[PDB]
């Protein structure tokens, strides 16, 4: 409120003149995803200025962006999916980016939440063969049979703990066998939850088996050559 009956306070005793010109001093910078994705060219970010190339570099390295797999791969089935990345390297208005984390959308989680079934969650803590420390959150629901005459579909805690152990084994094995980009490629066509489904096929009929969330916890040392490799040199223009 800035009305004439808005009672004055200390506040705007001394203010300034809007002369900063932020959208002229700023500079657009196109970020770009690793080669594991279809539409790597997604999203441009604004660097505050250009006199500090150091400031540009540290800001773009501190950038943590997020996107969805739907807009990432053109298949809008994965609208509920969402990942976070971070620009790790820059090159002349083009910025190398790398994966950071994953989650779903809250409305998807809410819709998957129902009243006559049990939700199981597995929260494993692992480090890749790429030495990326990671924490994985996965979820599934106790569906009912086609012959089910019962209103509910509830199972024993013995089944719960057994299936939990089975899941966590699957995650630990697959991640420790995998690397970072390998984990992303596994993560894309939902094949891991299908594997867990076929594993847990004998214990109980389940549904909505999904890895909920990915948490980067530690990242190893820097390798710009590896980043350039996983993304996919430059001369000048003779200014005189």
């Amino acid at each position: 409120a800035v009305g004439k009956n808005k009672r004055l306070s200390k506040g705007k005793k001394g203010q300034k003149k809007r002369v900063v010109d932020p959208f002229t001093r700023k500079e657009w910078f196109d970020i770009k995803a690793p080669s594991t994705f279809e539409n790597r060219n997604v999203g441009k970010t604004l660097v505050n200025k250009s006199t500090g190339l150091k400031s540009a570099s540290d800001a773009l390295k501190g950038r943590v962006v997020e996107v969805c797999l739907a807009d990432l791969q053109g298949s809008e089935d994965h609208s509920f999916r969402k990942i976070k990345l971070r620009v790790d390297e820059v090159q002349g208005k083009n910025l190398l980016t790398n994966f950071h984390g994953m989650d779903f959308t809250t409305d998807k989680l809410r819709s998957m939440v129902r009243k006559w079934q049990t939700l199981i969650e597995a929260n494993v803590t692992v480090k890749t063969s790429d030495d990326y420390v990671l924490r994985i959150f996965a979820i599934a629901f106790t569906r009912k049979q086609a012959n089910q005459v019962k209103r509910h579909s509830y199972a024993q805690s013995s089944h719960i703990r057994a299936i939990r152990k089975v899941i966590s084994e699957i995650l630990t094995k697959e991640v420790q066998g995998s690397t970072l980009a390998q984990l992303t490629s596994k993560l894309i066509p939902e094949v891991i939850n299908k594997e867990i489904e076929n594993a847990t096929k004998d214990i109980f009929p389940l549904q909505n088996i999904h890895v909920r969330k990915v948490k980067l916890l530690k990242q190893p040392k820097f390798d710009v050559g590896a980043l350039m490799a996983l993304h996919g040199e430059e001369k000048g223009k003779k200014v005189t």
């Binding site: 441009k44 604004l46 962006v65």
Partner: peptide
Amino acid sequence: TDLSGKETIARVTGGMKVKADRDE
């Protein structure tokens, strides 16, 4: 904001828009 939520493009407030204290 821009990408990664860092470059803050704009920001506005309801009371600042309509200078009243009920109408914030």
